[PDB]
Ligand SMILES: O=C(c1cncc2ccccc12)N1CCN(c2cccc(Cl)c2)C(=O)C1
């Protein structure tokens with residue numbers, strides 16, 4: 001029993017974190033096999049950040065311009081290349097702690113664990129979700145660039161995020177491990193803003209199913225709804241539209257609790273209309289949207 | 302920017318988790334040096350749990366009755382002894398991954414990371430607090446016993462909790478690593494209940510300081526209060542008393558934000574008497590009490606391990 005915001009154990013990722021320095025800039029790198037991945041902006045100076053020409057800045061660098069430190073050991077850089085917004089530094093030593101891994105690009109609503117790092121050293125682990133506006137509400141300070149997001153379903157680590165920047169509203173933007181940004185962001189100091197964010201509806205429904213599995217039924221009601229009437233109401237509360245894919249994904253939780261998806265949608269519409277009236281659901285006075293249907297099944301079962 | 306419920310990196314503890322089997326019961330063990338620690342109830346059958354005589358049940362066991370698996374390697378048990386509610390299995394191999402560690406017993410209000418494990422394999426890490434009623438609001442299923450709670454102070458892992466049971470309300474009970482239960486609980490299948498819980502006041506204040514550091518100021522006000530007046534309000538709302546020690550601990554956060562502790566108490570008093578009025582603090586519509594003053598400073602300063 002109980003339902004917590006739970007992160008994956010971070011050990012497999014901790015053994016991959018290194019410190020990358022290029023000139024005066026120091027950030028984190030991810031050392032897998034003989035390659036160290038880090039944000040390409042590590043090569044920028046203060047006067048380069050508005051409109052950097054990364055190809056031009058990179059061509060000017062040699063291997064010895066990159067200092068990579070793994071613990072108290074300096075790794076030797078023997079190659080460097082750029083893939084989109086990530087810099088890949090070939091090193092002369094394969095990481096003996098390299099776990100079984102893969103690079104996966106995630107979609108909005110997906111959740112992942114973030115291992116926040118400073119100077120190549122892990123400081124904390126927390127759970128995040130890719131917001132519908134492609135930002136993440138992380139907890140990051142100066143020096144956290146290169147910190148990664150991942151999932152570890154079984155013993156394979158799927159790396160899905162690398163931290164690049166903090167937007168003016170305090171939210172974060174980054175890339176997948178192939179260097180492609182999530183959202184309409186660029187690795188430049190130019191004026192950029194997160195679009196209006198919305199609530200991840202499918203995740204809220206998953207979390208209501210978690211509450212039912214854990215014995216909470218107060219918010220249930222005798223009503224159902226059509227998918228289209230649900231969407232017309234939910235969009236008025238800035239909730240993401242619920243698609244037939246989301247309804248299908250909730251099928252196993254629906255079968256387990258005996259509550260049809262459109263029946264739970266009617267509970268959600270009522271919760272949006274009435275609020276909680278002094279009550280809580282799984283220890284929360286707000287509707288939680290950073291648990292996916294997969295997270296609920298893994299944690300409750 | 303941002304403020305998350307953040308656990309310590311779990312790697313140092315992951316390298317200590319093993320699977321302990323005794324008969325039909327399988328749970329988790331903590332392997333440090335040449336000793337594997339686990340709940341002593343691993344030796345009980347369902348009948349034994351009703352009124353167990355652990356000394357009598359243990360005397361009947363030999364070393365080979367304990368199967369310890371570290372990854373895909375079976376460890377050889379060469380001794381077994383009991384310390385309070387923990388069983389200590391001496392093994393023939395010291396754990397090469399043993400970090401610098403200590404066993405510490407924590408106080409209510411103190412937070413720690415829990416590494417939830419099943420079959421000796423870590424499945425998740427989450428941050429929680431020792432409640433004032435000595436339970437933890439954990440997230441645990443069948444097979445989670447022996448999962449541990451810890452903090453990291455510098456480069457040393459301080460183990461503070463080992464999971465033993467789930468109470469009827471879904472909250473959890475366990476011991477320190479010396480086998481002493483937190484709370485008035487016993488390791489037996491008998492009627493037990495969590496007492497009425499209270500809110501950890503010093504932690505709520507620490508979290509309000511975190512909200513201010515992150516740019517949320519709506520709840521601030523021009524008022525201050527006395528410690529005696531505030532403690533009268535705290536008692537009325539099932540909040541733990543705030544002591545001068547708590548006020549002193551909040552000193553650095555008070556100096557950093559310019560909000561004196563008693564000034565933040567007046568914000569808290571107003572929140573208790575009026576609610577949030579449709580507003581949120583750090584994405585919450587409830588006052589969060591599972592961040593200590595140390596957690597707030599650590600997260601807002603980026604201390605690494
Ligand atoms: O190191 C950080 C950083 C990271 N995360 C959270 C922070 C909170 C406070 C202060 C600094 C940070 N930076 C430097 C790079 N940087 C950036 C600026 C413009 C473009 C690019 Cl790709 C990157 C940042 O946004 C900020």
Ligand SMILES: O=C(c1cncc2ccccc12)N1CCN(c2cccc(Cl)c2)C(=O)C1
Nearest residue numbers: 001441442443444445465466467488489490
């Ligand atoms: O493995 C668990 C367990 C743990 N945590 C959360 C769970 C949620 C659902 C089902 C089982 C669990 N047990 C077995 C031992 N056990 C117990 C029973 C009586 C006394 C003692 Cl000390 C211990 C339990 O309470 C329950």
Ligand SMILES: [Cl-]
Nearest residue numbers: 572576577588
């Ligand atoms: Cl309140």
